[PDB]
Structures are given as structure tokens and as C-alpha cells.
Structure prediction request, 1847 residues.
Amino acid sequence: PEAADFAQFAPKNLQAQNFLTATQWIGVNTQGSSLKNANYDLRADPIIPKADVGPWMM
Amino acid sequence: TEQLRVGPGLGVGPEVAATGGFHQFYRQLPLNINEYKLTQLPGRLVPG
Amino acid sequence: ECLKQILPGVRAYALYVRDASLPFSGGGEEAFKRPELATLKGSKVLSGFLPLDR
Amino acid sequence: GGLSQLVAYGAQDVYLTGNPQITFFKTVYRRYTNFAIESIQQTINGSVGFGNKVSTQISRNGDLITDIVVEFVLTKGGNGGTTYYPAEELLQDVELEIGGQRIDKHYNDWFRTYDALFRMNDDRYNYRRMTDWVNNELVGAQKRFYVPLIFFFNQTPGLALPLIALQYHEVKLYFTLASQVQGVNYNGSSAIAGAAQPTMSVWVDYIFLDTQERTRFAQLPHEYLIEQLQFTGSETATPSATTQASQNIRLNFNHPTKYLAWNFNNPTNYGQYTALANIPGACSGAGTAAATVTTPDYGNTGTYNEQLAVLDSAKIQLNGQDRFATRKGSYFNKVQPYQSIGGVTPAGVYLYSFALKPAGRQPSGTCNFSRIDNATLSLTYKTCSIDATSPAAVLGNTETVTANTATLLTALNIYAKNYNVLRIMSGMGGLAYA
Amino acid sequence: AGGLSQLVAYGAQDVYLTGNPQITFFKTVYRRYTNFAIESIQQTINGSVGFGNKVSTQISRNGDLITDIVVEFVLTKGGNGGTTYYPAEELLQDVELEIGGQRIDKHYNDWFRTYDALFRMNDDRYNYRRMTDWVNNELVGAQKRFYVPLIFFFNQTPGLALPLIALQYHEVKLYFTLASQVQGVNYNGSSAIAGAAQPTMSVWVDYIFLDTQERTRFAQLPHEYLIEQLQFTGSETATPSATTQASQNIRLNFNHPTKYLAWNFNNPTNYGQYTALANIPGACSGAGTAAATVTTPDYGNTGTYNEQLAVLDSAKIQLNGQDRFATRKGSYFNKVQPYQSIGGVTPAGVYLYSFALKPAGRQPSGTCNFSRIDNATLSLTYKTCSIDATSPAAVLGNTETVTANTATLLTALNIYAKNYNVLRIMSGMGGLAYA
Amino acid sequence: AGGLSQLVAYGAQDVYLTGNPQITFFKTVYRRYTNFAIESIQQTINGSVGFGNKVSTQISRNGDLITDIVVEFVLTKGGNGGTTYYPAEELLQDVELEIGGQRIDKHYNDWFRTYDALFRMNDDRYNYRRMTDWVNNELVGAQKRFYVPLIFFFNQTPGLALPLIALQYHEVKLYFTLASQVQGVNYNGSSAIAGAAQPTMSVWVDYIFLDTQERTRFAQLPHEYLIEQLQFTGSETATPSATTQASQNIRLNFNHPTKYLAWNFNNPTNYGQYTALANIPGACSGAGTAAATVTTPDYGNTGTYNEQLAVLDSAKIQLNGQDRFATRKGSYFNKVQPYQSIGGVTPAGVYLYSFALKPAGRQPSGTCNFSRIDNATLSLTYKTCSIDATSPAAVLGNTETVTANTATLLTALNIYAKNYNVLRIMSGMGGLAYA
Amino acid sequence: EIGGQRIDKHYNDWFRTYDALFRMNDDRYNYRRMTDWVNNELVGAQKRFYVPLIFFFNQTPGLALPLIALQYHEVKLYFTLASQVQGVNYNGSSAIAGAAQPTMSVWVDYIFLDTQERTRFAQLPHEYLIEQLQFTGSETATPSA
Amino acid sequence: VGFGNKVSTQISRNGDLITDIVVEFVLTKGGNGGTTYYPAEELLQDVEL
Amino acid sequence: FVVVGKFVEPIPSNPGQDFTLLPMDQTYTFADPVPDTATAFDVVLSRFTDKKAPADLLKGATFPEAAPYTDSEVENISKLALSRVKGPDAPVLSFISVEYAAKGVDNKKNTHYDIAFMVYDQVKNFSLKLVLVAVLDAKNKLWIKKFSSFNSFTPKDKGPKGVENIDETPLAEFIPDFVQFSRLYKDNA
Prediction:
């Protein structure tokens, strides 16, 4: 809602700028764990099938 | 205003001024808490 | 998530250019506004003399 | 430094800051209507004096009214330690009548109970400053007291009484002044020779509205959800030294009730809700040889010392069924107000709420006693076996006992604060339910 | 039975409370807010700190918005317990808030004392006292770190945080004047304390670090903040005496929508003394014994709730020469006004008259716009100052219309008014909508 | 004249306050709410109670939602007045909140003391003390029923009432550990009190009974509650010394979005002792007389506001080695932080650092997520403990950076933090979203 | 603790009770050799002790805890150290002046699986039959003469 | 309640049916053993339903 | 659901008279749980007003008539209007007095009236203030333009919401960018 479409703005070619700042996603874990990214095992560590199920399995 | 002056009697909506006299019929039983924590194990026999 | 940063990103840039390019914001007296006294004493300033009617 | 907290953003923060809805760094003040407030003196009809009845009619000076403060001027009939909230005691009662209908009525004891239970901290202290002598003043000292009223319209502007909408009804406050006020004109039962009669003045704070709002009040019908006090006095089962008295007191109350409040008292001594004893502050001369455990230290009449209270336990039942499990008296004195008010309640004063927040104005759960055939408060009293003249007997004793002087607390006062609707229209007002 | 028995007994009277229900109480929806962080940054003080000196600081651009400001002091007791009274508050003689050279507001040591006396309360007030005084019977030579929070509009709520980031062209400065003397620290009454230490001072500002989306808006967009300002003038108090009830009509040179007026009478010699001195416990140096004097206060007990030592018999305020309300006793303005409007307990000698329903809050709730009033006047009647202050019986047993003979020492009157204005910030600059 | 003379004085400066009005204060519309009732119901304690016992209760499905919980205890004094300090609080060593076997939260007796020290105030604080201690000069053998309210998120507000009803397959339990010893009840310092009675105990849960429409929604709909949790770790204090300023780098093994972090330094021997003992009134057993000792506290007056007896000199919190704020005095955490964030008064020896604007409330209003901070550290600097605790001149006349020699006994450090997690309920079961 | 849930909890007394009932012969002796001084060591003697844990996964490979399958949950051990230990820092009720504070270290034996086995453990759901210890303390009815 | 007084009660509606009714009295002996004869009965002079 | 029968008993020997003791069911409902103030009277009295037949398009410029109103044209047309309330379920509405009575004389020999009066409903035991805007032609025909209850003529709007607390300061809106966080998460899949 803020900033009412300014069609009279001339620099509409903002291609020379990189707006993405990936500073908040540096060093995250699965959800909220804290283990300093835990790069301990010198292996590939395969993908675990975490299915969004309820509190029980079945 | 009208000054309703509701009388005694529970277990019903506000449209009833009075329901019971000295003893209303509405009664509530306790929920019998921890009823699931009782197993009710049956009895069995031994080899004759 | 990218749009959460970009859409405000674009806004920030466009407003930046306004300020980078134009003096102060490019605005007028709206920005350079002195306080209004806004009191009534001046309402009682009276004329010193009355001219003859013509 | 602070920047590292902004950076340290995780999945857990989505519930706190994802897709922001609000900000803490911007406040919006809401534009309001135009009004002004003025304090105007009312005329008192009748005759001011101890034991006399007086009344006042609120003059139609403003559009709405809120606060009412009664001024009294009293002199001390003895030294510091002889009075206890004497202006509170003096205003024996006050009745609020609109167009001849009784909307509400308060008693000196209610003011004491209400304060003891619902006010707190410095508000309570300032209140005491306006109703008593708190700087060790001496005999002959003169002081003006201010006793605020606590009727629904005196609690919040939100319930300002729309006098403008009451063209056909007068609003009157009827007052009864106490026959005696401790430390002012009487000392215990003894009259104080030469004591001065009170000077009284009633002040009403009026709201003056601008045109649009004033018009709405005058032309719209209104329904105010207001509070009323119900009160009855009862004979207290007399506790004794050998047995624990118990009593079933029928709660002859009606209407959606936010809470019940009660106390036991010695009607001789205003504000005495506890037993007296020879321990500091618990009686006149307490702590020494001259101590009298039958005469309170009036200036220190109230106390938080539960040992001197008389309620062992209590429950409320409705139509013979338990409302809640029986709890010890100290629960109604300490926990109830801890949970529902957030202040500290003096020993001997008890509360049981049917509401989440009874101290507020917004309804938050009520017990409608109009729908109960037999509402009863069941009290169990403590055993009054302690020799009050022996501090060891008092201070080192058990849970279920109290002072032998506790049997003097024979007056049982039960209050119920409820909701009703005061509807104003046709230039007249009146209650939705009786 | 149990709670269900209350729930089931629903009647006609309950319709107004729960019929066609709109809300519940048992489920709270918290709103999602922006990311932010708060950090305490030390500011540089220009000028020499010391007694009687004037120093200043410019708030750095170390965050985007600011709120709390705390001025720290290190003081050393120049005497024993009971010789000081809120000395850090006394020391900070005044504080001026200027944005771009434009005075936004200004506080005085006395205002800090009045403000506290009038608006803080209970444990808040006590904790405040702990941050400005010695309250545990500390002795001579004791050294302590004091904290004096500022009370400007942006120092009270995050909602009014000053957007320094939006003030790119204007600097924000705080000018602080330190008192020439502080009781019990470098002077004892009028006497200097040999060997007294100079204060050490530091100014701390709590900064708000915004995330990108909000930071941008603050830097780039215009803002409007409804703010509070303090108006203040000093006056000579008509001197009351043993022989008379002095009267005085004080024109109130105030402007803007005003929430309230506040005032006190005082003895400029003794900071915080708003009442007469007397030989009653806590009312004078040595009260209760042979050495008692009613020429010097018990400094640690300078303030009091004993109305008998106050000097205002009655007062009214007129607007354009007309009564605004009926004349009321000084005790009304001391006890009832703040009862009604604040809810705390105001010390004797400090008075309030509100135009607002809740002047202690942020939201405007009725104001007196003095820019639209030609003659606002405060009319005061003083008490007869006939009581012999050296005789506690004379004081404790006195009447409503009289006070201590020592009450004539309260010759200074401080009248304050707190009002609203609008702080506008645009294109890197800022100032107020009204003068 | 009168109020109308103010009302008429409307001008341009009032437009921001009253033009195109949005609200009025003269007419309140109360909201119609849902039907409910509240009942206080005793729960069954499984396991013997007494000193050193550990018991638990399962909250029965009497009502639909649960809030306030009070643990009743009956204790008898093992000595005279002045020998106990919040003994019912000391007695309840800890309480663990578990749903479906998952730990949701857990409080400790010291937490209750720390929490109170920071967040309760005025008469609430006093009334609380009345429910956990003897405050009317009771003597040996005195018996009282004590009430220890729990302070879990659902025990504070109806807004977070725990939806016991929506947890059809999960049990909600509370585990209570009772202290092996309670000062002035069964022990006096290290000595046991012969003949001391064992406590009686009962747990009371206040249940909310909902009507059909609301009850059904709670039972059937999924829920997400934003709740608070306590994190706690004990540390050994770098032993304070008379020879230097001890210092310590404490890893902050904390996680989750934290509203605040708080800590205290104590002598584990004496519950609630957060300060050094000294021969000044109230600061030690027998203080002020010949019998005074600085090895035993005046238990009834264990707490104090005299920071001179607090050990911490200064502190900072670092996040990933970066100072999160400039180093501030221990007195800054003790007095200013709670002034700013709570509004109460904090006892000496207890320190608070907020990451939130209003940590005393429910709305997060700013948090520090320690699950995203690889290595947070609390860095504490201690005072030099060179003051002769037995000599008031030294105890009271000393400098900012020193404390009592007896401060060396404050060898325990308790660090607490409050953070936000989400209690989710779905398909009849529930627990916390983040482990 | 796994995922915030208490899986189990042992007490020093349990270790003593457990040993009293389930260890034996040289196993019991060797155990004592790892937790005590059994060769008549004298005051001032220093010794490293090895206290094995007895949780279900500490007893058999068969119940090895699949840390690999717990990607979103942490596994923690909380250890409480006694305020006093006889013959170490206390002698009956008396503190021993000069007693040293303990040094502590926790060692975990980790199983490294090859690719096929590791992948299955990481990806498949598991049901491990485990043991838990329930424990409460009680007052002993005291007998007399 | 006292000697020579008339007192009464309305039976409450707590249950559905009523059977046994017992009037309890607490009396003290004004003399030694042998001086009373079924005094609780003597005291309850009459009961009207 | 209660069963009431005849109670078969033997014939009385000497007399024929006895105590009947008829059954009674003591229970009373309300017509509405909330008390009616003026709405029911507003609809019943609104259906008794005349149509557009008066044709008194002119403003009238009614002026008040200060008098005790003992027996004049105002109370006469008020009683004439109250006598027109003769419906099947219409209330009795006993007349009491008149306050704020205004008369206007139209140049076409007409007499308009704005009469506010008080009525007392005896069946409902309460009073109401009614507004009667009625004109009178030269042929004694009394046309009623609007006959309803006072306080029912509400103003245009009720501006202020009527906040309950004195100072609470609700949280301000975030006011996001071009998509306002709704179309952002809704447009993407």
C-alpha cells in the first residue's frame, strides 16, 4: 500500500542493481537447531524424508 | 424500560422468567475424572 | 522471500535516486517549512487612526 | 553489536516477525471528540452534622458527569493513633437515585472493604491521606478530607452519566452521616467533649461536550452496562474457644455478579476486621504492660496478620451443589486478590470472584444469582482459643485458631458487585432488570 | 455441579454480557512485528564536565531510531547519610533538546523532581530514587554511579522513537547544564565541602537497529510525531506571613494544547524543598531533639506528605479573566487532582491541575489550548504563616488555613505546563509544526 | 466561564487531536463475550510429600482450558521471627511442565526468586511474600498455609490458557521437587532442626469451563500458541577476591528467540542471598550489635537494595565474539535495565539485560534468537572484595569498584533466559514446534 | 534427552543398585576398578575413572541410536555432579581442605556405516525397543527396638 | 437455638428423595452421672412436619 | 411433561365436598429477554401514520408555545392522535403531558404541529416519549406526517468508536510495499 505507483519516475531500469541480500540465511540449520551447522561427518549426509505428518506416524 | 425481573431457575435460556418452584428438575452429574485410568480387568481361571 | 526483499529493494532504490539526484528530496517549501506561530495575539492589532469617508 | 541480533534470524522468528503486521516504532494517537471538564460545587439540602441526613441534587451545569468527591472538614478529638479513615467512617452511606429509582447504594464499610480489596500501592496511600490524618497530627488538628465516590459513573468517563439525556429525571445523592466517628467525636463509646461538627461540600466533575457529541447524547437512546452493589448485614455465627462455629448464610443476591466480598467485624470499631492482641499494632498499647486487647490501636486498626482473622474455610454452593471445593480463608484473602486484582488485601477481608478480572470494567464472567433458587455461602470459623494478652500464644500458634478477642467480630457483611443496564431514553432513565 | 453450575444458570440479564458473543478471553492473537534490536552506545561529551559547567553531546548515527537516554554520573558523598537528596537529579540543572538548531524541548532539575513527585510511583519511584540518591544509609566518601533517565517525548515510548536516520541534514544535540552546587556532595547548605570531588559524567543513548524494509522507510519517507513539550516559567511567590494570607494573580504565559499545569513553591537554597521546615520528625535537620533547627532540612527527608507544611490555601485558574472552575483548596490540587488523573501520591507542596482525563498517558485526552486564550491566570491564596515551627505541638495540632512561620522561606514559584506539538521530519530535516 | 470557556478555545493546533474524531472517552461499548465459568479444583498428588520428596500430578480433564495453578503447602517455623526467607518458595525446588512426555518448560526455586526480584512489584510483591513467608513477626511453631502460584505462560494469562480439551490423547503433567532443606523451617544454616514437621502439600488448578460453541471449536480446530519458556544453566562464579578483580567468560548455552536474559550471583548456602553479608542493619545476622556476624544473613531480611554488597562490577554480552552493547556497570543491569523494561525495583545482586522493549509482557516486542548465534558469551567483571564486612565505616563509606570481603562466598552464578516457542496442537496431541 | 523429550534418567544410586543386581564376577570387579581406588591407594593419589552409562544404547549395538536419522533433533546428556563425594572432598560430614575439583570428559563411541546401510538408516523410519528407568524416592517407615 | 426456643428449617432441594433425618444436639452435664434421662429427647419437645 | 390424572379413590362416605387442589405449572417466559424500549412501539405507531395526503411541502416555520398546556390545541391533537392507535395488538398508551410543543401557521390557512409528549404503557408499566408531526387543514382534518417515538430519530452517524481504556496506544499498521504480504503469498502457487 505504501509508495503510490509513481509512473512519472524516470529510472525504471533498475537492472544494474542486486537487491537480494542473503545475509539472514548464512549458517541456518533444518528449522531452528544450534550446532554451528554441524559439519562433522566427512561424508555426503543423504536427504532424510521428513514428511509433514501430524504428531504421530499413523 | 420494561424491567424484566428474571426469577430463579437454571438450565434454560433467558426467555424463561422462572422454571422451578422449590426444586427444579435440572441436575448435573460430575464428569467422573480419570475414568480412562481405570482398566476393569476381568477374571480368569487356572488349569482346572 | 526474494520478493520480500526486492519489492522494498526497488522502493529503496527509487527513493534513493530521488535524493541522490535532487537537492534534499527535490521537494519545496513543504520540507523547508518554518513553524507556524499559530497564536491569537495578532488578532488584536488595531489601526491607529480612521480616514475621512470618501 | 545490535546488528548481530538482526542477522541472527531463524525459523522460530516467523511467528514473531514474519510478514509484519505491526510496528513498535510508530504510534498512532486516535483523534477524539472536543470536550472540557469542570469541578462545580453542589448544594447540600438537609442538615450537616454527626448522625444527620443530607442530600444533594446534581445541578444541570454540564452534559455528562463522572467523578464525585465529597469534602469533609473534621478536627481531631484526640492525638495521633486515635482515628482511622474518619472521613470514610463519617460517610455512613450514600444512595444514588435517578428519577426516584435507587440505582445503587454504598456504605462506609463498603468504602473500607472496597479500598482494602481493590485499591493498592500509592493509590491506596494517597486515598488514606485524603480520608485520615497520616503525619501524626495532634488533638485539635483540623483537616479537609476528600472522599471519592465509587459508583459506576465515578469509575470511568466511559460510563459518564448523561445528565443531558435525563431531562425528566433528577439525579440525587443521599447521604447519611455517621452518629459517631472514631477519634473525632467519640473515643470508643465515650463522647469527646467539645468536638466540632463536620463541614461538608459535594463536588461534581462535569463534562462539557461540543455540538456533535452533545447532540448524539441528547438524541440517541443509550444502554449503559453498569455496576451495582448489593449488600446485606448478617449475624455472624459466634466462634468460640472450644468449637469451630460454622454457618450457612443464604446469599440473597440477584443479577450477573462479578464477585462476592465479605468481612467479619466488630461494629463498635470502624474497619476492625480482625481480632485484637498484645502484639505491636494489634491493640491500643500493644506490646507493653498497658496494652488493652479489647481496644484497638485505632490508627493501626487494619492488619495483614492473618492469625487474627476468623475464617477457617469457605465455599459457595448453588442450589446445594458445590460451586468450587472448600478453601481455607487465607485463600480468599491472599490468592483470590493475587489472581484477580494484583494488590494486597488486609486480613479479615475476603474475595471470591466469578470473573476473570473483577477489578476492571469489562465483563469477564459472572454468576447470575437471579437464576439460583438457593445461593449459599458456607463459612467455617477458627477456634478463638488464644489468649490475646500473650504474644507467644498468638505469634507461635496454629492454622485453625485465633484470638479469644476474635469473638467480638460478630457482624457479617456480605457484598456482591453485579451488572445491570441503565437505559436512558425519552429524557428518563432506569434499570433493565430488577 | 462445580463451575458448570454457574455456566448453566444463564438468564435474561446475561444477554447484555454474552448473547451473540463477539470476543473471548482465552485465546490471544499476537501481532507479527518488524525485526529490530536495541543497543546502548556511549556518546562523546564536548566541554568539561564538572560543577557549574555546561556540556553537550551530539547523538551519533549508530542506529536508525533512538529512545531512551541516560545520563550517568559518578558522585562522592561530601557528608554522611541524610545529607543528600536526589543529588544526581539536583546536579543535572537542566537539559535542552535541539534538532537542527531548533529547541524542541527543555527540562530543569526541579522539573525532574516535580515530574517524579507527580507521575512516578510505588517501586518505580523508589527505583528511580536508587538511581539518583543514596538510600541505604551510605557514609561520607561513598562513591556511586547514578543514572538520570531523560524525560523527553522520545524517551518515554518506542512509538515516538526519534528517527535520526530521517534527519540526515540535521544534527540532534542534548545540552546539559550541571549545577554549581549539589547538596551533600560539594556543598552543605551554603558551605562548600573542602576536598569534594568533581563529578564524572557520561551520556548513553539506546539505539534501535531496524531491518531493511523499515530502515528504508524511515530514511526515505516523511514522518509526523505527536510530541509532548514542557513549558516553564519561574515566578516570585507573594510572600505570606504571620500576619497575612497573601494573594497573587499570576498570568500564565503558556501556549499550545495543554494537558496539564503543575506547580510548586520552593526554597531555592534547598533542592526539592517544597514545604516549610519544622521540628516534627522528618521535617527538619535534627527534628525531635535539642539540636533541631528549622533553618535547615533533613536533606535525606527533604520531601514530605505532611500538608501542614504546604503553603497554598487555595487556588483557581481563570481563562480570559473568567473562572475555569470553582476555587479549591491547595490540598485538592495536591491530593485529588493526581488521585483522579494519575493514581500516585503527590508530596506536599506539589500541585496539579489537569485539563486531560489521563495526563499521565501518551494519548491526548482533553487539552486547554492556550494559544486561543488571551488571559490565562493562576490565582493563588496562601496560608497564614503563624505556627512556631520549633514547637512540634504547634505544627501537628494546627488548623487548615495556617502553616509554619518557616513557610515564608518558600519564596520561589515554579509553574509548568505540559503540551502537545507536532514534530515533522522531512527531506533530512526536522522541527516543530507550531511555535 | 467554566469548562465551556476552554471548550470554545479550539484552533489549528487542535486539529491533530480532535478534528474528524475517531474515539470518545465518554461512552464505552463493552464487548459481548463467550460463556464460561472458572473453578479451582484440587488435583491428586502421586507420591509422598515432605522435605526432599519428588512428586507429580496429572491434570485431570475437569474443564476445557487451564490457567492459574497454585501449590498449597503447610509449613511450621523451626525457629523465631527473622529465621526464614520465602520458605515456601525455597521448598518448591522446581516444577516441570510436560505434555505428552515432551518437556515444555521448567522453573526452579531460585527462578521464582529471580523472577519476583525483577517482575513483581509494590503490593503484588508484598502480597506474594505473604503467601510464601512469615511476615508478621511469627514465632517458632507458627503454622501457615502458603500458596505458591506457578508462573508458566498459561498461569499468567487466560490468553494462553492451555487447551487441555484439544489434547485428547496427551496427558498434561507437573512434576514438583521439594527441597531437602528449608531455612528456618527444618534447618538453620547447616544445622537441622530437631522436631521439624514435614510439609503438607496440595496442587490446585483453575479450570475454565466453556459453553458448547466455544468448547467445540477448541476441541476440533488446530492451534498455534505463542508461548514463553525458561532456559536455565548454573555456573561457578570466578571466585571474587580481595587481591584483584576476578573476571569470567561464560558461554551462554542458550537457544530460541529470547525476550530477556537475567542472572544473579549467590551464596548457595542461603536461599535468596544475592549479596555479601555485612554488619550494617539488615545485612547480616545480628547486624548493628555485639552479636553480629557476617557468616550468617538476617534471613528475614536476606535481600537488600544496597549494591555495595553486590559483587558484579560490570558486564557485557558478546555474540559470536562481538560486543552486543558497550560494557556497563553491574548497577546498570540492576537499576536501569528494569527501570526501562519492567518499571519495578530490582534487589542488589540481581541483573537484567533485555532484548525486548517490554519483556515483562506477553507481546515479544523484540527478541534475540540464540539458536542463530554460534557462540554467545556473558563477560563479567567482579569488584575487588577488600571491604571489611564487619565494619560499617568500610562497608558504607567505600568506592564504586569495591565490595565486602564476604562477597567471595557468592560462588554460584545462575543465568536465566526467557524465550518464545510455539505450542502446537493438532489431532488431539501437542507440544513444542522447536526442540 | 532427544528432541526435548526425556527418554531416560539415571541416578548415582541407580548405578549402584544396577551394579548390585546385574554386574558380576570379574565384570563387577573390573567395573569397580574404573570407578574407585582398589589397590589401597593413599591420600593425594590421582586417578582417572571411567563411568560407563547404562542407557539402552549404551548396552548393545542392537539399539545403537540412529543419530543420522535424527537430523532435525538434538541428542543431549545432562550430568549432575554430586556436591560431595566420600573420601574425595568430604570425610563423613567434614569437608576436606585442599580437595581438588574433578576433571571431566565425555566419550562417545560412534559407528560409521558404509553407504548402503548409512542411507537406509538415514532415510527409513525406525522403531527401537528400548528400556527406561522409572524412579521415585520414598520415606522408609522406620523400625525400632 | 436455645432452651425453650422454637426453631425451624426448610429442607433443601439437594437430592430427589428424603429418608432419614437426624437432629444433633450438643449438651453438657449440669450434674453427675445418674442426673439425666435421655436428655436429648427431653430437649426436643416436639417436631412438626 | 407431567402426568395429571383423576386419582381414582373410593367414594367419600358422609360428605361430597373436599379440597380439590388443582395442578399448577409455575413457569413464566419473557416476550423477549431484553426489555423493549421504543422499537416495538415505533413499528406499531408507524403503521398508524397517514400517507403523503397532507401535502404540507412548505417548511411551516413552527414556533414554540410556552404555556402549562392544561387544555388547548396541542393536547387535543395529541389525544386525537393517541385515539388513532386502535389496532389488534396495539398498546393502550395512556397520555401524560407535553414538552416541546410547536405550532406553525401556513399562508394557505393550515396549522402544522411538532408535538412531543409522554405516554405510559400500563400493560408494560413504563413511559415513552413520542414525536407527533401532524398538520391541521382548514376543514378540521388532522393529517399526521410522522407519529413515532422520541430517541428513535437518531442522527446521521456516530463518529467515535468509544474506546474503553483511557490510554492504551494500539500497535500501528506495518504498511508494507506494493503487495501488502497477502497477494505475495497468494500469487506464488
